[PDB]
């Protein structure tokens, strides 16, 4: 929902847009037994398939100029262990709820 | 002066400054830009804006959150100005002048003991060895048991035999205060005559607990020593627990 709300964003002059296809969560580089040792965040790299399209200038509705589709890395997200304990900088952290 | 707003390097190589070196740097920057703009013969819409910005940078230094929006740093926090350093519960007045942090002090968990008298209190050995350390040096140098202070500190670092028999001469007839926070009324700080027990808990007399309002369920009390010869007589004739 957070991707589909923002994307697809277009150019300012209305000649291009970034289309969104899908995302994919890669494998964690380290396990939880050594993130508590080396002091690093137990996370998973987040990748996303983005599609950039170029619309023609003189054409009324011209999509056929080029289709650029590439996989983009953007940050990480910290995973959750099997009990609800995020591992941030080696120390196990718990996010409580909120009542608003 | 540049030692009341310092710029000190920490352990890891990152510096750590106070925030007056931002407001002062803004005043000096905009003042130099006004000196440059008055020699370029700039139009009036630029100079009238530059004088306004210089005035805003001056009163952002004298008292930050008063003119308009408060000036924020990089942390998205309002910078503490000169008037924010003398007011409130964090000024020089209410936190660093009326009440200070003192040397020759201690802190421990209190426990009840009924073998005492009304003017006595327990004290741990490992606490009175640390509170009365220069008195121990002055007694160890007088008896010739150590020829200098750098050879008298090693006799305390080893915890030898002769130290625990000098401590019983240093401690006797030397009162010591006992404060418990919050100190509501006048009886919230009293001076007792110490004894020496092993353990790690200040043993208090069971009758003074009505004055302290101290229940033995994990309370803590602070131990302050008087140093001089006038203050040691103001704890025996004015603040001893057999007088209150």
């Amino acid at each position: 929902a957070a991707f589909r709300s923002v994307f697809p964003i277009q150019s300012y002059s209305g000649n291009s847009e970034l289309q969104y296809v899908s995302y994919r969560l890669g494998e964690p580089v380290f396990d939880v037994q050594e993130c508590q040792i080396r002091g690093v965040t137990y996370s998973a790299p987040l990748r996303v398939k983005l599609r950039l399209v170029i619309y023609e200038r003189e054409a009324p509705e011209g999509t056929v100029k080029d289709i650029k589709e590439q996989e983009v890395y953007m940050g990480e997200i910290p995973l959750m262990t099997d009990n609800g304990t995020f591992v941030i900088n080696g120390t196990e952290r718990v996010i409580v709820s909120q009542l608003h | 002066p540049p030692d009341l707003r310092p710029l000190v390097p920490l352990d890891g190589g990152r510096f750590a400054t106070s925030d007056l070196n931002d407001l002062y740097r803004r005043v000096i920057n905009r003042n130099n830009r006004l000196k440059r703009l008055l020699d370029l013969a700039a139009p009036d819409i630029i100079v009238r804006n530059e004088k306004r910005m210089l005035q805003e940078a001056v009163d952002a230094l004298l008292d930050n959150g008063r003119r308009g929006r408060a000036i924020t740093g990089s942390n998205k926090r309002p910078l503490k100005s000169l008037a924010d350093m003398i007011k409130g519960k964090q000024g020089r007045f209410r936190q660093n002048l009326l009440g200070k942090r003192v040397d020759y002090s201690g802190r421990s968990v209190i426990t009840v003991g009924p073998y005492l008298r009304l003017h006595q209190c327990g004290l741990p050995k490992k606490m009175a060895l640390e509170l009365f350390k220069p008195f121990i040096y002055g007694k160890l140098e007088l008896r010739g048991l150590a020829t200098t202070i750098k050879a008298a500190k090693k006799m305390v670092e080893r915890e030898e035999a002769v130290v625990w028999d000098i401590l019983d001469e240093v401690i006797r007839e030397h009162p010591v205060l006992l404060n418990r926070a919050p100190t509501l009324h006048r009886l919230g700080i009293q001076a007792f005559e110490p004894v020496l027990i092993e353990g790690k808990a200040i043993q208090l007399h069971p009758l003074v607990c009505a004055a302290y309002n101290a229940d033995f369920d994990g309370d803590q009390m602070a131990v302050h020593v008087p140093l001089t010869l006038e203050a040691q007589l103001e704890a025996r004739a004015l603040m001893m627990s057999t007088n209150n």
């Binding site: - | 819409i45 804006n49 306004r52 003119r67 929006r69």
Partner: protein
Amino acid sequence: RTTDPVRMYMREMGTVELLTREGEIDIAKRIEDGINQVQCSVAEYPEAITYLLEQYDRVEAENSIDPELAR
């Protein structure tokens, strides 16, 4: 009725009007006619004679111009 200085600055700059294509040519012609009076009015002074003396005596020992135009 405001205290944000950026609103004051934008309100003060808002009173003036943008320029067209020929307006910049008009103001450039004004600047050139302002400096040309100083150029054609300094020609009746001995400092202009000193400038002529130094500028030809510099090239005495000597678009990017041809040197024959300078001579």
